[PDB]
Ligand binder design. Sequence first.
Ligand code: A1D5Y
Length: 182
Amino acid sequence: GPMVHITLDPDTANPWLILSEDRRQVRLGDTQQSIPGNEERFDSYPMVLGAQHFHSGKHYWEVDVTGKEAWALGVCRDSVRRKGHFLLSSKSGFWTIWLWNKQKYEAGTYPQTPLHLQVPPCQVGIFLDYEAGMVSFYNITDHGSLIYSFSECAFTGPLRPFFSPGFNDGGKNTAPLTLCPL
Ligand SMILES: C[C@H](O)c1ccc2c(c1)N(CCCN(C)C)c1ccccc1S2
């Protein structure tokens, strides 16, 4: 089946992130960790990838976002640049949605698409269909209604799960992203 046990890849995690020992949770830290500057690590934003690689097929997982004022979720090319600043955008190899400012939900098209969610999600489901070129996001709190779907994605290599528990803002958004047991 499509359900997949996601774990986080510590080698990609920006130093502002704290990963749980089981690598199923991630949160913003109050200070930067001292860790290596290996090529895989995102150096400019608090992001981290799942360890799993997708080359084909259908895949699904869920993330708890309860009570966070900001976060970003989805999938990206393994080949996306890790160093420096960039746009979280389908044009750049990212298929993501995000919340910021407590109630601004957007999809990472470029230009960005504003999202209008009648029921703020406490848990989000991400569905990847490699062959169909689709990444879809579901509001678990709202009985699995569709938040947004990217279609006509032109996948060419391995894809990775993508996660950010927020950006650095002074330590208000400390709660973790948690991968849900499926
Ligand atoms: C600008 C570029 O696309 C970019 C790079 C890195 C991040 C974000 C955007 N945001 C989205 C902000 C969209 N509007 C507001 C510009 C974000 C949102 C939620 C959690 C982490 C992040 S980190």
